[PDB]
Amino acid sequence: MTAVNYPFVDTMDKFDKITKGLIFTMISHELSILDNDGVVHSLHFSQITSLIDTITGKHPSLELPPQLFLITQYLLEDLKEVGEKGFVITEYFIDVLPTGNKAIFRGTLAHKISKKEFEFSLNQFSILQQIALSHCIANLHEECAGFRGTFDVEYTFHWTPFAFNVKFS
Amino acid sequence: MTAVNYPFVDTMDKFDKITKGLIFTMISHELSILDNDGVVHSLHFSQITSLIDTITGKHPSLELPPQLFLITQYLLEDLKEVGEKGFVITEYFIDVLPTGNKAIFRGTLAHSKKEFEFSLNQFSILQQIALSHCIANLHEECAGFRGTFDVEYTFHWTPFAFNVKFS
């Protein structure tokens, strides 16, 4: 019986003490998180995954273009409907406002010439949401890859089919 | 200017408070976890992902066949080397022993025939859960044997049958 030890013993020991604490037989699938203030927030495994995946950028939703990301995240049914009527976003601005946790999603729809303009004040645009949207901007082109994990910064992302830019305030 | 509110406000609130605590600008990428007794364990994002994904079954290493899973997990170089010599595992047993945190990975290699046996130590509840996901991913019939820990069983595998024998 060739005795073989696990390579990451110490790292494994941490997992054991945690997993052993989740036993109640089954695993609770829910981990408590302690913040700076000292408050425990009970989050399910799926929520912890989502929080980490968004901050790291591995979340599948962060591959979406910034506009499509906002549309999927804020349930912008009106902009889906105009897409089904032959309209496409020809230009859009995302104004991120850290104070107030808002995001102004404004732009111009065109048939391609009929043109409709839109404007949405996306509330609750927290730090997490600011990080996520920076991942969408960075995944559009390698030119914007440096703008990744940017939060608590007021900026406007201007997009056209010919140029994309981030202007700071 | 139409005002659109986020659907999951409260779920987001929890994230925000937590995310505020990781700010040092950049994020700490490390979360502090509290267990039942009241002990805090500060684990990195990568570790927490690995722990959660292992318990849920989403980890990529759990798709591997159970023997190839063990080989990769414990760095069983000897079984790779004999593989390079035209030998293949014709039969293998995995005896899970919860008391003592061991897994006996025994079996037979054939091209002459060399049999093998490994005592995989530190086979904890997390690893017992992982192995149950590999057994379940082998066939749909064995899917019920998922998330099994603290149970003494032997997994017998042949090319023509697979079985879980409980003790």
Residue numbers in the entry:
A (entry chain B): 1 to 24, 34 to 121, 136 to 192
B (entry chain A): 1 to 24, 34 to 120, 137 to 192
What does the publication say?
ChmB formed a homodimer in solution, and the structure revealed an intertwined dimeric structure with the N terminus of each protomer forming a short β-strand and an α-helix that pack against the C-terminal globular domain of its dimer mate. NTS-mediated interactions define ChmA homotetramers that measure ~11.5 × 11.5 nm, whereas CTS-mediated interactions mediate interactions between neighboring tetramers. The distinctive U shape and overall dimensions of the ChmB dimer, at ~5 × 8 nm, suggest a model in which multiple ChmB dimers could line a hole created by the removal of four or more neighboring ChmA protomers from the lattice (two possibilities shown in Fig. 5b). Indeed, size-exclusion chromatography of ChmB at high concentration suggests a propensity for higher-order self-assembly that may be reinforced by integration into the ChmA lattice. Combined with our data showing that gp2 interacts directly with self-assembled ChmA, these data suggest that gp2 is an integral component of the phage nuclear shell that is directly involved in the docking and filling of capsids through an interaction with the portal. Based on these data, we propose that ChmB mediates capsid docking and genome packaging at the nuclear shell through a direct interaction with the portal protein. We next aligned ChmB homologs from jumbo phages that infect Pseudomonas species and identified two highly conserved surface residues: Q53 and A159 (ΦPA3 gp2 numbering). We generated point mutations of these residues (Q53A and A159D, respectively) designed to alter the ChmB surface and potentially disrupt specific protein–protein interactions.
Pores in the ChmA lattice are less than ~2 nm in width, large enough to pass metabolites but too small for passage of most proteins or messenger RNAs (mRNAs). We found that one of these proteins (gp2) associated directly with self-assembled ChmA in vitro, suggesting that it is an integral phage nuclear shell protein and prompting us to name it ChmB. We identified a key protein, ChmB, at the center of this network that is likely to have multiple roles both as a pore for macromolecular translocation through the nuclear shell and for capsid docking and genomic DNA packaging.
